[PDB]
Symmetry: C3
């Protein structure tokens, strides 16, 4: 009778409870208090209500989905995925998420506290899957939003180690969808071959989505995998912080990127990356411009630690027939990055910053400007010929480098013959320290190899801090590169023994608004006059020089060459020296040649 009610599922609803025997507290039943929390256990049962234990040969999907659906009906709450158990997912979800190869449909206000482990069963071997999907429709253009959905805890999402069946397939952990105020915190995503672990937003739709204190371990494992970017941030006001990214597979060194930032006001900070090809893409893709507009601005990549095999930060923008993408107002700072131990050319070209062409290779679609790269450290082993502070392979409308430390093969690089980027507002401040790891490795190479269509409104202030006499030059402009309204200086320190310092193969330094200084060795001859006496350069290629001054001591007693020189119409330098005793003098002097500076 009463016994029957008590042993029934309604029993706890008949056992009274008052918080700590407080007479002022609500008189409730045990069931009410138990109803304040909810776990997978409360839905992980057979049609008869008997609990099912999870494991290898149990598909937890439908039970988890029921839990999510039921809590969604009550306006939200948090479902615990209990510790001490692994909950295997063994089938595709149905309805709206079936188009996304979804396993589980996330729902608004329904949080998952994942304390235990979630593993994909062999069913998903060689198949595409997106484990959690916040889209409510197969077509995301027609999907509703996912709001206030947080996945967090000390738990694990394990992708079972299965390889991709085909390169064309997609795999994700959490596809939040058109996602507003959603986050993933504390979760370890491990043991997979996936396209992404997490995607935030959809073509700019979404806001305030974050990945914090998560771990991403060994999420590429096959040559089948076309591409990996662990977190793809595709909504504004969103980002990644204090995360850990690690790959061991050789394939990851060629295809894997830790983060992509694709919308405005997004960030990547305080994270550690190891074994990846790439740190981050920072890009406005025209195709993703619907939600938040055509401009990726306020892009922050800060205070990260990376060992990568390719490019740390890749800037881009591209266009569609109808929309043009723009990237501006980017800051890259405080990052300490190195190219991991590898053979030259054995992975994509090493670079701190890459200005990349779009996905179809186009290098004349880009609109990237107002980028500040500052207070970063970059290092590549001496052997890694393909390493650069910046690989500038596409049109650049501005990039500012200040107070960085770059210890790699090239400072500014682009391959000759390939793209011919149009370059505006490239600023390499003199405060960028050029490291010495690659000294004596630069035979035939130009430290700044300005392989561009044109350079305008740019500053290159070259400052060495050690000798490298192996390099062909500190900076070289091929005749094909136009240079105008630019400042190019090579500080004399450690350059005394250099044959070429700055090289302008088309004599571009003669430009009306080109401001240059660099050291050169010059032969001079004087008239025989006793007293104040002119010295002239034997060669006549200094028509562009506004002043020059000596960088050599004068070994002689009976005379001295001029300390300072100007030029003459015929291209000679001319200065006034002093013959204590008369006689024609002939000397070879190291000069700082200067034009308008």
């Amino acid at each position: 009778q009463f016994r029957a009610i008590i042993e029934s599922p309604e029993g706890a609803g008949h056992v009274g409870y008052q918080y700590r025997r407080n007479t002022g507290s609500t008189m409730r039943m045990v069931s009410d208090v138990l109803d304040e929390r909810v776990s997978l256990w409360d839905f992980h049962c057979d049609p008869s209500g008997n609990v099912i234990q999870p494991g290898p040969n149990v598909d937890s999907r439908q039970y988890l989905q029921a839990a999510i659906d039921y809590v969604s009906s009550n306006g939200g709450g948090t479902i615990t995925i209990p510790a001490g158990y692994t909950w295997y997912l063994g089938s595709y979800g149905v309805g709206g998420i079936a188009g996304h190869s979804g396993i589980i449909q996330l729902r608004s206000n329904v949080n998952l506290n994942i304390e235990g482990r979630i593993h994909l069963s062999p069913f998903f071997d060689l198949k595409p899957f997106q484990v959690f999907v916040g889209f409510d429709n197969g077509d995301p253009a027609s999907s509703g939003n996912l709001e206030n959905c947080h996945i967090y805890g000390h738990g694990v999402v394990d992708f079972g180690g299965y390889e991709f069946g085909a390169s064309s397939q997609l795999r994700n952990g959490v596809a939040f969808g058109r996602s507003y105020n959603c986050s993933v915190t504390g979760i370890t995503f491990q043991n997979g071959d996936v396209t992404w672990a997490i995607t935030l937003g959809w073509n700019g739709y979404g806001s305030n989505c974050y990945v914090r204190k998560c771990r991403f371990i060994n999420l590429v494992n096959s040559s089948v995998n076309a591409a990996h970017s662990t977190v793809y941030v595709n909504c504004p006001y969103s980002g990644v912080e204090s995360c850990y990214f690690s790959m061991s597979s050789s394939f990851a060194r060629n295809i894997a990127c830790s983060v992509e930032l694709h919308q405005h006001d997004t960030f990547y900070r305080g994270s550690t990356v190891n074994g990846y090809c790439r740190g981050a893409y920072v890009v406005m893709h025209a195709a993703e411009a619907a939600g938040a507009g055509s401009y990726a601005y306020n892009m922050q990549v800060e205070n990260n630690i990376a060992v990568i095999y390719g490019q740390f930060v890749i800037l881009g923008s591209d266009v569609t027939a109808t929309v043009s993408g723009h990237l501006n107002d980017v800051i890259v700072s405080g990052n300490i990055v190195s190219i991991g131990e590898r053979a030259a050319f054995s992975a994509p070209f090493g670079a701190f910053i890459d200005i990349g062409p779009d996905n179809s290779g186009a290098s004349n679609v880009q609109d990237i400007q107002r980028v500040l790269v500052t207070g970063n450290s970059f290092y590549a082993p001496a052997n890694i010929t393909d390493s650069a502070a910046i690989t500038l392979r596409a049109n650049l409308n501005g990039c500012t480098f200040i107070a960085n430390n770059f210890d790699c093969r090239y400072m500014v690089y682009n391959a000759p013959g390939t793209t011919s980027p149009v370059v505006q507002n490239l600023v390499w401040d003199k405060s960028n320290v050029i490291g010495g790891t690659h000294a004596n490795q630069r035979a035939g190479q130009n430290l700044f190899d300005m392989q561009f269509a044109s350079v305008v409104n740019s500053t290159i202030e070259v400052q060495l801090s050690c000798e490298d006499l192996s390099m062909f030059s500190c900076i070289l402009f091929p005749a094909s590169c136009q240079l105008s309204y630019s400042k190019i200086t090579v500080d004399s320190a450690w350059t005394k023994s250099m044959s070429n310092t700055a090289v302008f193969e088309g004599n571009q330094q003669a430009g009306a608004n080109v401001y240059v200084s660099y050291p050169a060795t010059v032969n001079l001859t004087s008239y025989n006059t006793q007293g104040a006496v002119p010295f002239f350069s034997t060669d006549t290629n200094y028509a562009w020089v506004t002043s020059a001054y000596s960088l050599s001591i004068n070994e002689n007693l009976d005379f001295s060459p001029p300390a300072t020189y100007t030029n003459k119409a015929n291209g000679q330098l001319v200065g006034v020296g002093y013959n204590e005793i008369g006689g024609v003098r002939s000397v070879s002097v190291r000069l700082m040649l200067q034009r308008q500076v």
Copy 2:
């Protein structure tokens, strides 16, 4: 009998429980285990103990207060504000918090896990309110402390959208009070017209208070609102990190500031701001000096992302009759900030740094020094005439700028006629990159417009990275500004066509300890002597010049002007050139004029 006990509120205290049937575990009753957690449900009942459902026409205040009071009595714990429900607050609290228009009194060690939503009912329309108040007295000087009180979860505090009834009113979300080890984490504060969302500490009393991962959305909405600063940090060793601040109302663009730091060892980092007038105030107010002293030092504003309409960081200090405020040891770094799209002068003057006068307008009370602004990016649209790296409107005892990128109308600015600040130790390192967005907009304007009473021990190293021939000058000192013991240089790059580079309207560059260099165009005439021959400037205003050198090529064959010049007592420049053939020469040359450098 037994049935009666079981169905009574004491029933759960009669049902035994042993954790997982472990014989080594404590033999308890269900009630004991249920007593480990506590929710608003346990106090949200009528006088008869029957639960009351929350909602529009239910005032949850007294029940929440009872819960807090009861848990406070047991030494603390955490009350859950359940998800899936909105709990409306409908009346003022009583006792100590009545003076603060408090709704709820917070108590020490009593945490609130806000998972559901908390909404203010229409009762508070046009009224002042402080939702949570940690003061235990109407007079904060006589208030006890709030300790170890943490508010956190995925929940929402909603201010109901009500406007201020009068500008004189105050509104707050969490007024922690004299607050030690208190924090707010994860909470969304939205939909209001408030003075602040959160205040930490009281006039320097308090420690270790933080706002982390919170969102602040649309918390100004009326022209009635006198002022808004979302988080006001008024105790040391406290700060804001990884928060999101957003306003849409036009009124916010004129009055709203995201953060104020008012005490030592405080920080604002990793946050995103949009639609605000101001990023942060960093200030020592004499009036708030009781708790932590008279010095705001160790002030950090780092790695934030902002779109604002006024000033990013505002430095200040002021005084009372008895106390003088001091601000020092501040760091502003890594921030990427822009002035949002607006008409010139349509909001408070755009500035990355503002040295502001105190609240009564005084500009001669300030003691601000040892500030480092570094590795920040600042951008304002070309149209925004009122935009500056620094608006220096009050006395400055030091500010150091290094390796920043500033792309706005002015670098250093102050309005003429207005304040006449006394300036010491302003350091604008040459590594600050000056952007080109405002090139061709600067007609009648001085890039560095040194409208001060005096400048001493200062460095301005002007380096352009593109042409702007529209500007009247790169730097101008009016005669009213004293200049001494300072270094002022204008790099020649992109300046060749400029009429004025550095302008000293009172000839201040002649000062004994003024160190300057800038380009000037100078007319010279030579004697007729064949051979080494002097050239002299026709004008006699170079009495201050220690050396000059050519920045022009020499078009002539038969002679060359001097490469380098010194001066003469009468103010002429004089150099020694060379007449291959005799004849009086007359030339106009671009020179780098130098004084003691």
Copy 3:
């Protein structure tokens, strides 16, 4: 009968429950739901299962250990240490942790949510203790791992204020051991005399361990304490963020360090330190190289706020007979640090960076290179003679300084006679601002006091921003220091009245590959020739000078000295000036002396 079962410990296992009366939910018993959580209460009982209340005269150790052991047996979970109670620990643990003076053995997957307080009883007075130990063996070489063990909450670990019994003793809060994915979050560690609060990893074994949002308050209190480092990070991919460290005891000012980073890819960020001797050690100890190798690389100390009494960041590496330690790829940025108010020499020598000798004092074992120090602020009161940007006391293979602000007594310092460090690749960029707080205090002192065995491949670009005529020199090299292949420049600004600017006591600036410029005052005499006329220096010590130029105005009408000078074999400077009227001229001029620059 039924009553008997219900009042028994099995009773809750007989009371049915179905989540919110949902017919689709699992039919369970109350006990099942209660079994989803676990607290110290469930094991804090006598042999008869009756609960024991915690407190002063109750030793909670065995009960907590039983709880941990039991949850470990079920594959993990989280034990709550309830709020509102203090749980005293009163004895040593047993077995594997007995060797580590362990109190509690941590176990994998078993998290502790510490909401209440944990206090050490008087038993531990004058004794060594490690409160939580994740080693499972007395010998860590033979210990298994601790994995997925997280300690977190709003609770407190209190060390009872007991002093060390002897300097030889060790004391720790959490010794995670060979620790993989373990963390401590939110916990206050207070009131002790300990060696550390937390240690992560063991000699490089471990990964992904973190200390976040923790507080460390007054953890040194006796002159007995040999040494303190609050968090010791001894496994890679691990770090400290957003923590608070505070000491009040005078002893802490001499022995206490906030953090040590001893393995690769480790970080210390966003933290506030007060009252400590030292901010961080960043070091590769040969002895700790077993787990993660011989290289500490990717070391990040960023965005911290410190008031310390000694050295902010101490770099080191040392060796064993068999292993050599290496430190490279370090970044120190964004930190705002000051030496607290103290008497000169009353604590270890104040320094932003210290290149320290190893523990046995050796200064010739170090291999430290590719360090970048950038965008930091450092300040020491004017009185603190012992304050330096860098104390360089041991061999340095590279350190790069850019865009810092240093306001202390020395920029570069080492005590004479003591160590004679060999120095390579020291780069002090011109963008480092030198503050004025110590102006007029530097009598007998060299701002850069290059007390080394040798300097090579180094850059010192000295830029003052105010006068200090008290200093003996801006930079001085004793004869014992070799200098080669280096650049040393002193900017002329604020140096006009200085007797010595750069001093080379062994004439090292004459080196073939030494590139220098600095101001000097020079006496010149001319020949009597009317017209172009040479001026020569009276002194003959400029054999090394490649060019010089005037930094003085010419007071005379009838002549002018040369604007620019070269030299002659005998060591004289020589230039060509102009005698309007003939006569031997004699002048004293301030020159910028230049060698190869």
